[PDB]
Every structure is written in structure tokens, then in C-alpha cells.
Amino acid sequence: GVKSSETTLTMFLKEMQLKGLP
Known part of the structure; x- marks a missing residue:
């Protein structure tokens, strides 16, 4: 995208x- x-x-x-890797 364009940051925004x-x-x-x-x-x-x-x-x-992070809450769905293990």
C-alpha cells in the first residue's frame, strides 16, 4: 500500500x- x-x-x-503462530 502507501503506508496509510x-x-x-x-x-x-x-x-x-504473533497470537496465532504456535
């Missing part, structure tokens, strides 16, 4: 992925 549609995306996925 990519940064927040990576931020939300970061949490979900």
Missing part, C-alpha cells in the same frame, strides 16, 4: 500472527 494503507495493515497482522 499498509503500515496499519502490517500492525494488525503483526499482532494476529
